[PDB]
């Protein structure tokens, strides 16, 4: 079957003339950020990774998906 038990089945408009929005529309759902790859420090002998370093003084503005 295609219906989950925990969440359940999530599945006169002609007289209305309008179609109501549905909560959870993928066209408006958030995008979970991509997981960054592991550093593999054994290649360089260092814990530095350009994609994983965190600057101590940055304000942390939004800068990526999610």
């Amino acid at each position: 079957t295609v219906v989950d038990a925990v969440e359940g089945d999530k599945s006169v408009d002609t007289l209305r003339g309008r179609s109501d929005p549905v909560a959870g529309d993928p066209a408006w759902a958030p995008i979970h950020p991509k997981k960054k790859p592991e550093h593999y420090a054994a290649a360089t002998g260092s814990l530095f990774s350009a994609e994983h370093i965190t600057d101590l003084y940055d304000d942390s503005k939004p800068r990526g998906i999610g």
Binding site: A41, T44, I53, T54
Partner: protein
Amino acid sequence: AMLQNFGIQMPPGTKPKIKNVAAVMVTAELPPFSKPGQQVDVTVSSIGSAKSLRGGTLLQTFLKGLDGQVYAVAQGNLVVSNPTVGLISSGATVEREIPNPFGRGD
């Protein structure tokens, strides 16, 4: 927060009125081929408004790498000469290894 870690939780808004405690930043350099159980020096520098760190004792602090993981734990007695910077000769105990490319290749 440290006192909560030991079972003493003050009511919110309580002023400790502490005068023998200073917040510091602890830095250690991990030598190559450092194995768990070894000890390295740590530099302790005050970041608040403490007048002197002379005669102090560094409490348990976790030392994090550039990847955000803990690789050493630092304690010990400070030896200060600048009274706000002190050194500990074996403050940090290494708890984790960093892999090395030394044995690879031809």
